[PDB]
């Protein structure tokens, strides 16, 4: 029950996450403090006000070191070296890692250190030493005592996930290719100024941006059977949310078009009822805002060539659909937090 | 004589400087080395391919310690602190201060106590003791032995000035204000993230951010007599380049538009010949890119009210119409050195 939680990374998977938790009618964790390179006033404003998810409907307020919603006053912090974050002193069973920096195994630990107990990586996890769990795919094998350092992989990896799976189950996958068009995310530059990945340096807003991903070789972690079988890439176009994934997979168990989508609707309700939303309608971006599912197949787009070469398109709200696959994994904890 | 020039922060303001100067027929300076936070691997690049200025046509290559631009070589460094800066030991007459932090009257002199004769600034000159000059305004009052710490000033004040000046002599201003719809700069997040102006925190690509300024009191200077007469502000918006200014000025001398624009078309063959331009045409931002001018006017849009009220409009390339007054001013100093 009521395990104590906090956030290094109240920024984007930050608010989304929380606005998302305060948005559960039945919830396991008590998020208690938030450490954020902003002040209280600020963290206050931005939880509240959003350019994508509009406003928050909740009674809000603050002083010089805490922020209050409906009742839960939570604690706003201002420190950079997480060791210097008062973890111990506040029985913080659970740490949220949404700064996009401490995604090192080693960068994970500096919460344990300072004094915490379990930390969550809202992104792929770096190097050895972290459990990488995708909700509704392998969460089958979460056990508190396994790893105390866990990841929820990427917005994108999440999409790739359920679909990858059901693909493996019903026709099973030989090898494919992955191509996410993604919406700009604050690691880019508004317009050109320095940046180590020289595409990421280019004006996000006016410019198709191509970047690395391993968020697809981000499969095996969750699927043992899929070891470096499907490498993808990604391209970063001008919209501040909501993104879609382009799969392409030479399946072995020969197949046809609508028999694939058959399964997606089978699974759409069977196993994945609440994981994949299933969508024949003719829709675009601004139709998956506010959306909870993760993988979201555009059916009316699937395209089996020569029986073998499936192609399937898939939506998702990158910010939000994740800020739930967290608050789901996040719940998963308090129920084996032994 | 060549005065030898260094560039601090290879920003927007700092990369355009380089392209413009590096362009003209006869130049009086000599660019030698630039202090961005970035290898030479990267600076070649952001100079070579501007998202906005389109391919740059020139013989550019890099080593590990400089960038080479069609034949000529300048050294590149990574020092944040001005003082570590090997300026004296590089015979650096003039540096450019455009990281936009050492915009202080003080700190920007860290440049000098790092060797350099005189140091230029690209924003307003905050704190006392600093020169500001609006090319083709007070530019007439230039004194090497007056300041060592000059300033071209806000991208909007250089648009402003060569306007009000003009009206204050023809008709005469009682008082005014302005506002400018503005290209979205690098100082307001790509998305909603932490920040010190709650608005800037907000995603300029997806919104309309108004912000304060001292671009107006700013005019209350190089034009002495406009003393605490004009203020206002400006809104920024999803156009990555070229902003544009709506000016609202009273006067002590009644007129009619058709003449208002005539005197103006006047200062577009005279006192500002190359400061102000002119459209009888019907254009739209993207139409004023690469535009080597301080203030563009649309005659048409212009409009009189009773005779003692004047709505006036000015385009401008925030990025470039300025990196040619800097260049200009720079080469100014270079000619009245000592």
């Amino acid at each position: 029950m009521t395990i104590r939680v906090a956030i290094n990374g109240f920024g984007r998977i930050g608010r989304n996450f929380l606005r998302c938790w305060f948005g559960r009618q039945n919830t396991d964790l008590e998020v208690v403090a938030i450490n954020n390179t902003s002040d209280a006033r600020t963290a206050a404003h931005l939880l509240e006000y959003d350019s994508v998810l509009g406003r928050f409907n909740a009674d809000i307020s603050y002083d010089e070191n805490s922020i209050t919603v409906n009742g839960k006053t939570m604690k706003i912090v201002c420190d950079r070296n997480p060791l210097n974050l008062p973890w111990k002193e506040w029985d913080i069973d659970l740490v949220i890692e949404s700064t996009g920096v401490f995604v090192t195994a080693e960068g994970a630990s500096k919460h344990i250190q300072a004094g915490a107990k379990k930390v969550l990586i809202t992104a792929p996890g770096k190097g050895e030493g972290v459990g990488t769990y995708v909700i509704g795919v392998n969460d089958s094998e979460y056990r508190h005592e396994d790893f105390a350092v866990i990841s929820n992989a990427s917005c994108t990896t999440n999409c790739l996930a359920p679909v990858a799976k059901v693909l493996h189950d019903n026709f099973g996958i030989i090898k494919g290719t992955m191509t996410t068009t993604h919406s700009y995310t604050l690691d880019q530059r508004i317009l050109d100024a320095s940046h180590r990945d020289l595409r990421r340096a280019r004006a996000a807003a006016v410019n198709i941006v191509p970047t690395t991903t391993g968020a697809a070789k981000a499969v095996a972690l969750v699927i043992p059977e899929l070891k470096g079988k499907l490498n993808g890439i990604a391209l970063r176009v001008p919209t501040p949310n909501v993104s879609v994934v382009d799969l392409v997979v030479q399946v072995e168990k020969p197949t046809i078009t609508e028999q694939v989508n058959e399964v997606l609707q089978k699974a759409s309700q069977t196993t994945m009822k609440g994981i994949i939303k299933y969508s024949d309608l003719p829709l675009v971006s601004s139709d998956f805002r506010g959306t909870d599912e993760s993988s979201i197949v555009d059916s009316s787009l699937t395209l089996v060539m020569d029986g073998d070469l499936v192609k399937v398109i898939a939506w998702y709200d990158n910010e939000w659909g994740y800020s739930q696959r967290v608050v789901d994994l996040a719940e998963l904890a308090a129920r084996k937090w032994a | 004589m060549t005065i030898r020039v260094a560039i601090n922060g290879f920003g927007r303001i700092g990369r355009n400087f380089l392209r413009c100067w590096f362009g003209r027929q006869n130049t009086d300076l000599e660019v030698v080395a630039i202090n961005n936070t970035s290898d030479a691997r990267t600076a070649a690049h952001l100079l070579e391919y501007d998202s906005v200025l389109g391919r740059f046509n020139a013989d550019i290559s890099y080593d590990e310690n400089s960038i080479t631009v069609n034949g000529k070589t300048m050294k590149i460094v990574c020092d944040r602190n001005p003082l570590n800066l090997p300026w004296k030991e590089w015979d650096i007459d003039l540096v450019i201060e455009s990281t936009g932090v050492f915009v202080t009257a003080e700190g920007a002199s860290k440049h000098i106590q790092a060797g350099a004769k005189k140091v230029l600034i690209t924003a307003p000159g905050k704190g006392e003791g600093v020169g500001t000059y609006v090319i083709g305004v007070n530019d007439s009052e230039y004194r090497h032995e007056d300041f060592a710490v000059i300033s071209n000033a806000s991208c909007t004040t250089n648009c402003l000035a060569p306007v009000a000046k003009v009206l204050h002599d023809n008709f005469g201003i009682i008082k005014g204000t302005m506002t400018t719809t503005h290209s979205y700069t690098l100082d307001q997040r790509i998305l909603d993230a932490s920040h010190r102006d709650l608005r800037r925190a907000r995603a300029a690509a997806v919104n309309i951010v108004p912000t304060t300024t001292g671009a107006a009191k700013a005019v209350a200077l190089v034009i002495p007599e406009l003393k605490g007469k004009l203020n206002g502000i400006a809104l920024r918006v999803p156009t990555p380049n070229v902003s544009v200014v709506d000016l609202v000025v009273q006067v002590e001398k009644p007129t009619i538009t058709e003449q208002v624009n005539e005197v103006l078309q006047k200062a577009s063959q005279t006192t500002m010949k190359g400061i102000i331009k002119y459209s009888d045409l019907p254009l739209v931002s993207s139409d004023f890119r690469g535009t080597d001018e301080s203030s563009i006017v649309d005659s048409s849009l212009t409009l009189v009210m009773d005779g003692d009220l004047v709505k006036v409009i000015a385009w401008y390339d925030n990025e470039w119409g300025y990196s040619q007054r800097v260049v200009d001013l720079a080469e100014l100093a270079a000619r009245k050195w000592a």
């Binding site: 390179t37 950079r80 700064t99 996009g100 920096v101 992104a123 792929p124 990427s154 917005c155 994108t156 990896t157 996410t180 993604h182 995310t185 604050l186 690691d187 530059r189 100024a193 320095s194 940046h195 180590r196 990945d197 990421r200 340096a201 970047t211 690395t212 991903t213 391993g214 968020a215 981000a218 990604a234 970063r236 | 936070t37 970035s38 290898d39 691997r41 990267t42 590990e64 990574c78």
Partner: peptide, 22 residues
């Protein structure tokens, strides 16, 4: 890696070494 490898190892959340596996 010439410049970034390190600076980024020292100011790692700085506006310029920020990689979100997208």
């Amino acid at each position: 890696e010439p410049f970034f490898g390190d600076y980024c190892s020292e100011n790692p959340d700085a506006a310029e070494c920020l990689i979100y596996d997208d």
